[PDB]
Swiss-Prot record, chain A:
This is ATP-dependent DNA helicase Q1. The chain holds residues 282 to 592 of 649 of the full protein. A helical hairpin (residues 554-573) in the winged-helix proble DNA-binding domain couples the ATPase (and probably ssDNA translocation) to DNA unwinding. The isolated WH domain (residues 481-624) anneals DNA as well as full-length protein. Belongs to the helicase family. RecQ subfamily. It is found in: Nucleus. It comes from Homo sapiens (Human). Changing residue 241 to A: Reduced DNA unwinding and branch migration on Holliday junctions, small change in DNA annealing. DNA helicase that plays a role in DNA damage repair and genome stability. Exhibits a Mg(2+)- and ATP-dependent DNA-helicase activity that unwinds single- and double-stranded DNA in a 3'-5' direction. Full-length protein unwinds forked DNA substrates, resolves Holliday junctions, and has DNA strand annealing activity. Plays a role in restoring regressed replication forks. Required to restart stalled replication forks induced by abortive topoisomerase 1 and 2 lesions. Does not unwind G-quadruplex DNA. May play a role in the repair of DNA that is damaged by ultraviolet light or other mutagens. Residues 194-301 are annotated as: Winged-helix domain. It is linked to RECON progeroid syndrome: An autosomal recessive syndrome characterized by short stature, progeroid facial features, a hypoplastic nose, xeroderma, skin photosensitivity, muscle wasting with reduced subcutaneous fat, and slender elongated thumbs. It comes from the Eukaryota. The modification N6-acetyllysine is found at residues 227, 235.
Length: 301, 303
């Protein structure tokens, strides 16, 4: 345990340039002149993010496996001399962190598992002073990561465990990392949540989605998470919409969090077309035949 | 157990285009008009290889995570209808392989573990007909992958077992798999089962002691040695301060000197040290056993 690390989970902005502007707002405001790391999902993201941050005036350097040894030592020296402020790295990192004053490690995408997020965020605050660990959570990142870690052993479970972390809005972050491996003095984003919480019933929200999928399989169709959301919100190809299913009066990112809820509790299940995720009826959809069964998710009152 | 797959390991050409030409000669040699998969280590590997294969007349398609739905379906559609012959893919694959006639699976780079290689090479021969799984093994691939798997709990040990599979030239390929899985009839469907040679047991203990001199001297010179620098010092090349007086460069080929160091690494006479994606070789946990003048290190070599 590292008591000097403040764990925080933010909602990933759906627009790419809105996301980067928010990062630049943090790099220039809160972290002016402080070294940090930005972890990414692939090598292209690390390069794509580095380009944007550099255009906005941030001294950033990409770091992935396909870097030549000459360019790695370059980023090493410059970042260790604080001449480069942030290394926009990939998972090709971690073990060679002789930097004690890492003040923030932002996650442009969620980690493949909680053990990985502990290691990657663990690069922050090695000097035992205060440091922040931001984790930007996006619905789509669940599926571009799942198809890659599904072939690993228990890898899909290790990702849904990472999803539960980002979904949780009340339990302490350090408890959400500790008991996966089985004294946070208000040092995370959920402990400082003074607000109260309600348990919301979203059972018919689940039965409506099963209507959309049963009809889809009767139409010889497979629904990606976007197609399911679009049909839910009364958009997309009209034949996939179910007559009687009302588009909820909630934000899109709130409907994403509900589908990810049904996924990790296995009311829905993932099916693949190799790097393409399709949502299907899950093993726990059976329990919805009891007219009294109910599904709950914690909201803010 | 897939008894219709011929597993074989080949040495990876250190020259880039020489490797591609070898692959092209195989795609247009016995795999003409046959669908296959080329597995790579990263996204850029798949794109760089896809370009080189295309410019030589091969219908190839890159595939990784940072594609797009419009581009993924296009690859699925083209490649499932035999319009594309090979998909140059990263580990971003899986159960989408409803194609049952994959006839050859080539790994442009070594896998990260034995599970991944049994899973990635398992994309071939789904229709139970004969299919080939050719694994090219390169010394430098150990350290492109090791940086990404050290933080994955037991990723280093799982990669070193994948290296052991590549270093083996006697044990049956299906045997080497099964013992990893704790499982319990190859029918001469692997390269080592089809070998007709006898194998010499060679003592390389002094080769280990010689390298340990090179590493002990590099520490007193305030120097960390990459695997390349360790070999170049061994071969009497590179920086002159880093070669040790009396350590003679062996009369073995370069790739034979890599296999010896790879043996010492996976047997923990040497160990890895990182500067995050830059791997350094250092004295390992078992080099202390070399105080015993009777302790010997051996390696099976061809006769
Ligand atoms: Zn807390
Ligand atoms: Zn055999």
């Amino acid at each position: 345990n590292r008591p000097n690390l403040y764990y925080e989970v933010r909602q990933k902005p759906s627009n790419t340039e809105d996301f980067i502007e928010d990062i630049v707002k943090l790099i220039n405001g809160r972290y002016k002149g402080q070294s940090g790391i930005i972890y990414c999902f692939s090598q292209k993201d690390s390069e794509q993010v580095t380009v944007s941050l550099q255009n906005l005036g941030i001294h950033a350097g990409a770091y992935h496996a396909n870097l030549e040894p000459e360019d790695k030592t370059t980023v090493h020296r410059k970042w260790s001399a604080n001449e480069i402020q942030v290394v926009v790295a990939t998972v090709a990192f971690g073990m060679g962190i002789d930097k004690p004053d890492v003040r923030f490690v932002i996650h442009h995408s969620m980690s493949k598992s909680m053990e990985n997020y502990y290691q990657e965020s663990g690069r922050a605050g090695r000097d035992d002073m205060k440091a922040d660990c931001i984790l930007y959570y996006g619905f789509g990142d669940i599926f571009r990561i799942s198809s890659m870690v599904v072939m690993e052993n228990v890898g899909q479970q290790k990702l849904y465990e990472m999803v539960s972390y980002c979904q949780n809005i009340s339990k302490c972050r350090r408890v959400l990392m500790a008991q996966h491996f089985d004294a946070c003095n208000k040092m995370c984003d959920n402990c400082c949540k003074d607000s109260a919480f309600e348990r919301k019933n979203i059972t018919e929200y689940c039965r409506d989605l099963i209507k959309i999928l049963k009809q889809a399989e009767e139409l010889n169709e497979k629904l990606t998470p976007l197609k399911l959301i679009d049909s839910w919100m009364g958009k997309g190809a009209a034949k996939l919409r179910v007559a009687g299913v009302v588009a909820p009066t909630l934000p899109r990112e709130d409907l994403e969090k509900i589908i990810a809820h049904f996924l990790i509790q296995q009311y829905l299940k993932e099916d693949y077309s190799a790097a393409i995720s399709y949502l299907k009826i899950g093993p726990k959809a059976n329990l919805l035949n009891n007219e009294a069964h109910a599904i709950t998710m914690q909201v803010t009152k």
